[PDB]
Structure formats: C-alpha cells, structure tokens
Amino acid sequence: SPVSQPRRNIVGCRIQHGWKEGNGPVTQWKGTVLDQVPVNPSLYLIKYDGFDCVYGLELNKDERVSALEVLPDRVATSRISDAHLADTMIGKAVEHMFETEDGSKDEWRGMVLARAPVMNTWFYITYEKDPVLYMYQLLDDYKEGDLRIMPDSNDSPEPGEVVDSLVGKQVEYAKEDGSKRTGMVIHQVEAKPSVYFIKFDDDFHIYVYDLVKTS
Amino acid sequence: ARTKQTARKSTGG
C-alpha cells in the first residue's frame, strides 16, 4: 500500500542506530527490518549488513538501542533466480559448506524453513549444532556446489484442520542456576508445523526449535 | 565459500 497510515509501519525499511553494551563502546549498525511479531508488537526482526544472522530486538522500548533513525534507502526487491529451485529445497534437510580462514572446509547439517520476507532472494535456514535464525542466499551455494540437499521422509505440499499451533505460549527450562530460560513462542514454520520460532528474554537471537515434548 | 566469521555480528554482547 503506497499511502501511509498514522501508525508507523517500519517493516521493510532500512534503519540505522547506535548499539551500546553497558559501559562499552558505541557501535553503529544499519540494516533491514524484516518483520514484526504480532504476539508482542514491540519486537521487530532485523537483518544487519554483513551479518547472516537474524536478530530480534524491541527497538523502541530497548535501552541498548540509540538514535534509531530510518534511512531513505530502499531495499533492492529483485530477481528470483528460480521460483521452483527455491522451495524444492524448503522443508528439506541440507548440508551447507562453510570454510574457515585457514582454508579447512567444514559442513553444517540444517533445514530450510522458509523464504525470507522483504529480501526474497534470501532463505530462512537453521542449523542443528547452532539452532538460531540465519539468512543466506542459498541460490548461490548450490550453483557453486557448497549446498547439498538430501532424500528424506518429508511429505511436502486427521486430514481436517487441527488446533496445533503453539504460538503465544510461555516457556521455561532447566538452566543450571543462571536465572531461568524463560521465553515465548512467536511463530510456526509453514513447511514444518513442528518447528517454532522462540524468543527468550535477555537474548536477541531467534531460536528455531522443534517442539513435540517427546522426540 | 561462506564464512562463519561473517555469520553473526562481530561485536559479541
């Protein structure tokens, strides 16, 4: 919708702010606001420049954020290499090759949850050894041979609708002391209904977990 | 060819 509304729709807009760790140096980041969480509209999903990881920050009500300012810059909504190769891999497990500075190539098994909002050329991906929300343009790792999609028992798109969604829930965990790992489920992956986006307090990372309460 | 250094924000914390 081109015409604006009194509420400021700050989703899909390049922003810029100062980050201050308590009694530390002030850093300057810019990035793209990807989404806003409906079960807590204070939270926005942000992708910083040069950073593959997606972060969840309560930008207006946070104290660590300084000089929040919206750039006149526009996100490059653009070309989709193939509408079919992307999503032929969504919901499938993959092995993503990453190489260290030494040159020693490694592999990380993970699953492609969805397609990124705002930057459509990017894919939502989470890894097993590191279960958080990352953003990579996989359409490139495949062409260069750094991404392998492997055969698995994944039927992809009661037969009738079930009330299954756990969005809006409240979670707590067995932290060894260290306060308590409290949080809230904020999203359900539309390709894998068992996989959920969780957002804990005292943390700005979007965790991608699989909730079934029993294997 | 991707790099884990890039992946997360270099300033940690």
Numbering used by the authors:
A (entry chain A): 44 to 200, 205 to 262
B (entry chain B): 1 to 13
How do the authors describe this structure?
Spindlin1 is a member of Spin/Ssty family and was initially identified as an abundant maternal factor in mouse oocytes and embryos at early developmental stages. Structural studies have revealed that Spindlin1 consists of three Spin/Ssty motifs that adopt a Tudor-like β-barrel fold, of which the second Tudor recognizes H3K4me3 or H4K20me3 and the first Tudor module recognizes H3R8me2a, rendering Spindlin1 a multifunctional histone reader for H3K4me3, H4K20me3, and H3“K4me3-R8me2a”(25, 26, 28). Here we show that Spindlin1 also acts as a potent reader of histone H3 “K4me3-K9me3/2” bivalent methylation pattern. Structural studies revealed concurrent recognition of H3K4me3 and H3K9me3/2 by aromatic pockets 2 and 1 of Spindlin1, respectively.
Calorimetric titration revealed a binding affinity of 16 nm between Spindlin1 and H3 “K4me3-K9me3” peptide, which is one to three orders of magnitude stronger than most other histone readout events at peptide level. We were able to trace H3 residues Ala-1 to Gly-13 according to the electron density map. The H3 peptide lies in the negative charge surface of Spindlin1 with an induced short α-helix encompassing Lys-4 to Ala-7. In the complex structure, the two methylation marks, H3K4me3 and H3K9me3, are inserted into the aromatic pockets of the second and the first Tudor domains of Spindlin1, respectively. The aromatic cage in Tudor 2 is formed by Phe-141, Trp-151, Tyr-170, and Tyr-177, and the aromatic cage in Tudor 1 is composed of Trp-62, T rp-72, Tyr-91, Tyr-98, and Phe-251. The two methylation marks H3K4me3 and H3K9me3 are encapsulated by their respective aromatic pockets with buried surface areas of 214 Å2 and 236 Å2. Aside from the H3 peptide, the overall structure of the H3 “K4me3-K9me3” complex is essentially the same as that of the H3 “K4me3-R8me2a” complex with a superimposition root mean square deviation of 0.606 Å. The aromatic cage of Tudor 1 is reorganized to fit H3K9me3 insertion, which involves in flipping of Trp-72 and Phe-251 side chains. Compared with H3R8 insertion from the top, the side insertion of H3K9me3 allows a better encapsulation by the aromatic pocket, which is consistent with a larger buried surface area of 236 Å2 for K9me3 as compared with an area of 216 Å2 for R8me2a. Collectively, these data suggest that recognition of K4me3 by pocket 2 dominates binding, whereas K9me3 recognition by pocket 1 enhances binding and enables a more thermal stable complex formation.
